[PDB]
Design a binder for this molecule. Sequence first.
Ligand SMILES: [Cl-]
Lengths: 466, 469
Amino acid sequence: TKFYTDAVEAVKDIPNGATVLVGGFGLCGIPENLIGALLKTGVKELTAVSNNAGVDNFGLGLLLQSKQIKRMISSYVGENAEFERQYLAGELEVELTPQGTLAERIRAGGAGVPAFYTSTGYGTLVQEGGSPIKYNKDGSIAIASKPREVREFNGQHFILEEAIRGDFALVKAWKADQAGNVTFRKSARNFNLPMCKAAETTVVEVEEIVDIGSFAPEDIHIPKIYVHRLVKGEKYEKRIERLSVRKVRERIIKRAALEFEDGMYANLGIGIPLLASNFISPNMTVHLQSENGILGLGPYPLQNEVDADLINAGKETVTVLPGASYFSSDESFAMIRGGHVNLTMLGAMQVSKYGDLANWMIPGKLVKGMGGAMDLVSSAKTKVVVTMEHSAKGNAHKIMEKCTLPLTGKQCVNRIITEKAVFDVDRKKGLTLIELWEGLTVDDIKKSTGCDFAVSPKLIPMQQLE
Amino acid sequence: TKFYTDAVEAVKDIPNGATVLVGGFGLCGIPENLIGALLKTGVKELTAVSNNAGVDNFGLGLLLQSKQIKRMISSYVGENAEFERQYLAGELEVELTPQGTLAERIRAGGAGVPAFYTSTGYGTLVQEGGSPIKYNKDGSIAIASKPREVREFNGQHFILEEAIRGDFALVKAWKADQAGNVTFRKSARNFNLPMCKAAETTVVEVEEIVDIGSFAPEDIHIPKIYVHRLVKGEKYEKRIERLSVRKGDNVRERIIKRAALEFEDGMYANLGIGIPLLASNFISPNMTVHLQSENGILGLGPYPLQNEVDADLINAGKETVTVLPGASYFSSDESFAMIRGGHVNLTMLGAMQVSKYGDLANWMIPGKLVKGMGGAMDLVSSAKTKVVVTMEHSAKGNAHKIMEKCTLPLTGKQCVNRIITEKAVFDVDRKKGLTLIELWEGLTVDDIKKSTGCDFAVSPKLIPMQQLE
Ligand SMILES: [Cl-]
């Protein structure tokens, strides 16, 4: 590990057109001093592999502001209007990649694996191709994504994904010893760990440099072999994107809250699912998983508990309960993709008769990326429960024969909770109405549902947890 | 995580014919109480996925002794005569699997990846098939290994490997908190970490149970989500297979002293048993060389003084070792991500045979040496890592070891970059072949020609062979 005192000196040899991996989840664990040094060097035409695009005026967005990035390989755009503008305008190329796939491909790229199989993205634009990579000025499409090869293993369909390797990696970490060993703090680890292994030259910035021997050798997160250039960061602004402090929808939330069991491992999506966790009994123990690499999510912090290094999947500041753990992004999606999480509960725009899901794209309106949504529904072992309003504007169908919006996954939903009904979903037999809201009838549900359904002989009135 | 006080209660529901992953590198990090419970239950016909077979009378060897294992999926047999016997006799089925491939397949099995590609085992019996899985009573092959599909990526050949997943995993760990989170001590981590993620039911035994909050959350090695059943182990014998402690002819010494010139300052190296590891003694104190061990250590130091000895800290040869300041420990899957990814600068190992273009044979002598390949096939798999072979120039009866084509089973194809012998030093190219770059004093190019089974170019800057004293 070569030590540097000046960050510009550490990155001055990056060529134009280089592929650069950039650590960070939102603004959590971003290499802000190295990004700052790239503004000064002015290197351009970069293919930046990064999970998100930061915000409009910070993180990776700064390099979009200076037009130094040609292509983005990312999972979620988020709250970067400049990102969205440049992409829609035809100025920026963007490969929207499932977050777990992005993580595993970076890992493969550092672990000598050229390609591997995953069910994430099967039956979607990732697999079929045609995902817009570049737009023309006129509004038509310039570059579209190529299909991924499909292959069946053990009665199930998977797609082939190729390793991602960088010319450079720009990495943020908490501490480094004088030998070059590195550690990360809380959820600031995310993509920084795998990216540190998947590039020809890895440049790491750290908040503190400690003595050799300071780390327990078991607790070194990235061994020195992976760290090629090390710099102590001059300025750390501890920026927080979304402060979240503590001091008919309600119907869906209270029914969703009945999905939680004692000792359950759950990943809850933004909105209704996460709000349902408030109604969990104190006597019930539910461990909440976060895809950015946390197990054991707690409530939002009090003012004094706030931390830039600890955010949830929605980029909101959070806390952790006792017995929580932190891990890398590759590992978080190994967790998710392996079916280790008992319940995934997320919102939806559309569900089909056999459990196809659409919840990430509305063409020419919502193109922020899929995030970890496609990995979260990929396992058959994990119970996927959808929470949504029954019908759309003009009483248009959301539950239907076939989805009209782009798919997050095929035959992946196990249960649908709405304000009117609760449905069990089967991949072969279709929908079964198992709970019905009081005052409504089976005929009311039929004319709010775009496909037919069986009725359970033990149909009960819909439950609520108060 | 369900806590148990009795180990037999934790494992009593394992069915006959089950596939069971078993943690451990040799006798380092083995689940000895769970293995002990399996003796009592008497479950049989198991397919045991384990890196090694322990020893004759301990670890996984105990279950071989009781004939409870039908098939072994392993990388290295080692010092277990009973295994070798049962395997050769036709009583035991054995899939010899490259250690890093075994590690990555276990990982894939826990991470939702059904298959993936690797160059490890290409051009060998792993890829081409025909590796003996079962022998007949007459000594013929009853079951042979099937071929692996080959595919080219970026101008290079790789083989497809499928995920390994267990019905059960038997795992040894250092400490667990009351929440079920787990940690490992030193090199006892090895295969225990990945195996904890790749089974339907994972059963972990630990030396100590601490309270929740004892671990820094960043430093939890296996989060509770992976730990299904936890037991505090009753007895820990701290067994050491090979005690090696600190207080060889001139021809070997010659190879060692030239091998020692391969080390550079700031180099990352993985050194094999024998000559390569001995060459590390000759490294200058002013030179910093970080030694990597495939069982999951970076920063190997010398052998321990009597009081420094530790059952949890051994090298790839199963010998007790120490670590230098700034060392780190990691899982097996991670160690071979390291190796397979070309992160180690120099791999230096012994060989039985090297070919003109760098094919290597150093793991099998049919009907004589069938202990498995260990991590040897992964160690030569990367093009980024300089592979340097250290060996005697010729064999018994002045038979060739450097030759046109290897006659022994291959560790890898076109994977050796340099060959150091007591007579010569050769640069090896995959396209152009051998080039004599150093020549031992007193010998001539003609002497080398009649000790070498293929032709070779001579360097115009051929120097006398170097020695570091
Ligand atoms: Cl995201």
